[PDB]
Amino acid sequence: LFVEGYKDADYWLRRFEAEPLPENTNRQLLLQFERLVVLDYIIRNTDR
């Protein structure tokens, strides 16, 4: 299924390095990042 208005992870990642996120947003982003880790690690993704 197609999902709208996303961008390359590093596009934002770089933009956050410049002007950081309000801590609440950033806590959120980190919650998601951990889900990605678990997912990529279980299926031992070779290409992330």
Binding site: A9, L13, L29, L30, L31, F33, E34, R35, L36, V37, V38, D40, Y41, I42, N45, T46, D47, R48
Partner: protein, 48 residues
């Protein structure tokens, strides 16, 4: 080689932050339950 297919997100600063509670609470009950893993193997076999 361990080098050969890295997870690129591991170089990110966010990868240094320890895992949350939210995530241990979501995952640990599941993947530590030998029944849940066997369902997952089963369901993957069914797809593959």
């Amino acid at each position: 080689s361990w080098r050969a297919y890295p997870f690129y997100w591991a170089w990110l600063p966010q990868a240094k932050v320890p895992f949350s509670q939210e995530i241990k609470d979501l995952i640990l009950p599941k993947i530590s339950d030998p029944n849940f893993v066997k369902d997952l193997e089963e369901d993957l076999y069914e797809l593959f």
